[model samples]
Target: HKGDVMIVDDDAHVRIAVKTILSDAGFHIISADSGGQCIDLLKKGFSGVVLLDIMMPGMDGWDTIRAILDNSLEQGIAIVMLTAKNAPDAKMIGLQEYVVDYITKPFDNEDLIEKTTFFMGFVRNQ
Candidate 1:
């Protein structure tokens, strides 16, 4: 819960992979499988950033993003929308909704780590 990163995705494998990657990089990582779960975890947070997947069964990404932003639960937290939705319009809308960046699926492991490091460090300066 004290980690600087939060990954909200429904896929267990994705969560595990991300956890391992970030942990190896010296990041504290927390995760939840749903939008509601993420909100629940937010009570213990000030994580620098959230890696959010835009597609899930129960709450979906848009609703989840809206929930976090509407409550302002993400005051100092940035969200990077990670999804497989290839529609440019969808990504644009996600950006308008306050996503820090859109990272498509099938990402390279090193890139994910590097980007996370950049965001965490960038936010520290903010």
Candidate 2:
């Protein structure tokens, strides 16, 4: 089976829209509203790619990333950060290394499909 494609987003519009778009491409979607929540998905042996929102209400993206990386929950997972068109302030040293890529809003359909297609292969089959 193809690895699960999870969208960790607090914004409902973007979350559902992206999920809907990706889902149409034959990727099963897991929707999470927080960093805290998504970690549990990974811990539960999801083995997939995470389409993450860097700006969330509480736990935010960076915190969630730390939780994942620190706990070593990143084996079969790839983190793809999503941000607004003009937003900055991501891509730091160290943790930045684990991030597979960043996709700016509002969704570029081809880019989304292309990126996902490439990274999905990286997910661990185990």
What Cα-based lDDT does every candidate model obtain? 0.79, 0.80
Q: Which ten residues in a row have the lowest lDDT in candidate 1?
A: 87-96
Model 2: worst 10 consecutive residues (lDDT sum):
85-94
Q: How many backbone clashes does every candidate have?
A: 1, 0
Tell me the tens digit of each residue's lDDT in model 2 across 1-126.
455799999888877887777888888888888998888888877777898888887777877788888888978788898877655454545777778998887778888878776788876543
Q: How big is the positional error of residue 48 in model 1, measured in Å on the Cα after superposition?
A: 1.0
Instruction: Give the per-residue lDDT of model 1 (tens digit) for 11-101.
Output: 9999999999888878888888998988888877665878988888767777777787777786777788787855323432543557777
In candidate 1, list every pair of residues with a backbone clash. 3-28
User: After best superposition, candidate 2 residue 52: deviation in angstroms?
Assistant: 0.9
* Candidate 1 Cα misplacement greater than 4 A, ranges: 1-3, 86-97
